[PDB]
């Protein structure tokens, strides 16, 4: 066969140890999920690090400790109009309960009359997005280093019945050691089987989302294929100026590859960017192992990645604890707090 006896036994024992790890991780997650911390004038606002329709994130400095954090600020009334109440409650609750080296850590959450706040570890290296657009594309080893972290993170999340639903370079921060921190859990959800919400980011949507099917966690594996393609090409596989045209290309499903893609990479991507759910990697009997044991990952030491012992291909320059040089500049908007409480009943559980 492909593996000699010793290699086969090493890989089997490895896969059994993954099972043992995931069983304990689920114990810990459920305990925190069942039995889960600050206020605004505890922080100085420094700089907006990102902003979109579903909220904004600010660098803040904790007054007592001087530690820097990334504070997500959500407008309650805006969340209600956009029908994101449950999504925002999911984001806080999931972030509180998970624990993995490539998931950003939540430190505090609170609310006031107008807003909801989630205070996370500040990741100063910036978004993968910026670094990718600046350099153009990543070489295959560089892309593979990041991809491996996402594979492990999705193995972890999916074992807990959590779907992520917004993979994209914009949501992947680079930490001081060059490793990934996944941010923005606003579409994450605990899903045993099917779910139906039309959400995500157009270029990364699986066809079954666009086609309004009741879909499952395999949409995350499709999105991994989009991410790996974009990292290695510099642009995503279904690329067009407007969402309707992007959707048309996704549903047709015909992917074309740059001539510099290796055959191993193209084979992996054809099996992730697979319309037929009975054939899509990550959705088969062999589960995540179809991905981890693929030829394109043959040089990947999965334990060494998890342990953060692989030398990263890129170490961001770090000019100090509150340095923001790896982020772009955004128009700064006030943090307004009404004298009157808004949407108290909607957010009682937050």
């Amino acid at each position: 066969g492909h593996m000699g006896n010793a290699a086969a036994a090493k890989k089997g024992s490895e896969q059994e140890s993954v099972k043992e790890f995931l069983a304990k991780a689920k114990e810990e997650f459920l305990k925190k999920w069942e039995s889960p911390t600050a206020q605004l004038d505890h922080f100085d606002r420094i700089k907006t690090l990102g902003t979109g329709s579903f909220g904004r994130v600010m660098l803040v400095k904790h007054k007592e400790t001087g530690n820097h954090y990334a504070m997500k600020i959500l407008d309650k009334q805006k969340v209600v109009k956009l029908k994101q109440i449950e999504h925002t409650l999911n984001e806080k609750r999931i972030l509180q309960a998970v624990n993995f080296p490539f998931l950003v850590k939540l430190e505090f959450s609170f609310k006031d009359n107008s807003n909801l706040y989630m205070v996370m570890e500040y990741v100063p290296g910036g978004e993968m997005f910026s670094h990718l657009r600046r350099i153009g594309r990543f070489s295959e080893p560089h892309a593979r280093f990041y991809a491996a972290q996402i594979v492990l993170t999705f193995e972890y999340l999916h074992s807990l019945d959590l779907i992520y639903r917004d993979l994209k370079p914009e949501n992947l921060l680079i930490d001081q050691q060059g490793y990934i921190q996944v941010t923005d859990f606003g579409f994450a959800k605990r899903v045993k089987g099917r779910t139906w919400t039309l959400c995500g980011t157009p270029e990364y949507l699986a066809p079954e989302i666009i086609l309004s099917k009741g879909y499952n966690k395999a949409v995350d594996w499709w999105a991994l294929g989009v991410l790996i393609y974009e990292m290695a090409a510099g642009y995503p596989p279904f690329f067009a100026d407007q969402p309707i045209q992007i959707y048309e290309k996704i549903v047709s499903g015909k992917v074309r590859f740059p001539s510099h893609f290796s055959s191993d990479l193209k084979d992996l991507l054809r099996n992730l960017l697979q319309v037929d759910l009975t054939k899509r990697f990550g959705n088969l009997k062999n589960g995540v192992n179809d991905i981890k044991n693929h030829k394109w990952f043959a040089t990947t030491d999965w334990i060494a990645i998890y342990q953060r012992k692989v030398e990263a291909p890129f170490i961001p320059k770090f000019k100090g604890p509150g340095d923001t040089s790896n982020f772009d500049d955004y128009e700064e908007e006030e943090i307004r707090v009404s004298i009157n409480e808004k949407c108290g009943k909607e957010f009682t559980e937050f």
Partner: peptide, 13 residues
């Protein structure tokens, strides 16, 4: 031709 800037999420189609 396609979108090279940061991409917003959608909440519906």
């Amino acid at each position: 031709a396609g979108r090279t800037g940061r991409r917003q999420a959608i909440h519906d189609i």
